Amino acid sequence: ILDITPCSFGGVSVITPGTNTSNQVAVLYQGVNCTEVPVAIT
Amino acid sequence: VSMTKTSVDCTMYICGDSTECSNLLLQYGSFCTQLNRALTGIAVEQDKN
Numbered sequence: 810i811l812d813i814t815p816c817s818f819g820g821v822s823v824i825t826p827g828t829n830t831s832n833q834v835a836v837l838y839q840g841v842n843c844t845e846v847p848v849a850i851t
Numbered sequence: 852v853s854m855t856k857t858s859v860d861c862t863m864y865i866c867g868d869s870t871e872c873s874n875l876l877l878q879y880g881s882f883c884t885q886l887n888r889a890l891t892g893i894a895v896e897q898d899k900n
């Protein structure tokens with residue numbers, strides 16, 4: 810017997826200073842343990 | 852003072868991983884953006900409260 814689990818997914822929030830301040834951004838993968846974001850290395 | 856902040860992925864709920872469902876869901880217009888905007892509005896307000 811195999812368990813089936815839907816493979817990791819979640820909200821993506823993009824965090825920015827204003828465009829008038831910078832084009833650099835940070836990104837939050839909501840409720841994701843980011844061992845799995847490197848496993849996804851658009 | 853507050854309640855749990857639900858966020859729903861309207862496409863994962865309706866169509867979960869099916870792209871041929873997702874193309875049909877686009878025919879319904881902005882309703883998933885409305886549903887997510889509404890829940891995001893509630894979620895931000897739980898911190899304000």
Ligand SMILES: *[C@@H]1O[C@H](CO)[C@@H](O[C@@H]2O[C@H](CO)[C@@H](O)[C@H](O)[C@H]2NC(C)=O)[C@H](O)[C@H]1NC(C)=O
Nearest residue numbers: 817838839840841842843844845846847848849
């Ligand atoms: C993210 O996932 C990893 C597992 O891939 C978690 O690492 C485990 O953490 C517990 C508690 O410290 C340890 O008992 C395990 O031995 C750890 N396993 C490994 C492979 O290191 C990691 O803690 C998770 N992150 C969070 C915030 O929960």
Ligand SMILES: *[C@@H]1O[C@H](CO)[C@@H](O)[C@H](O)[C@H]1NC(C)=O
Nearest residue numbers: 825826827828829830831832
């Ligand atoms: C950007 O911010 C500066 C003040 O730091 C301001 O002078 C400028 O008018 C702002 N940009 C725009 C497009 O208004």
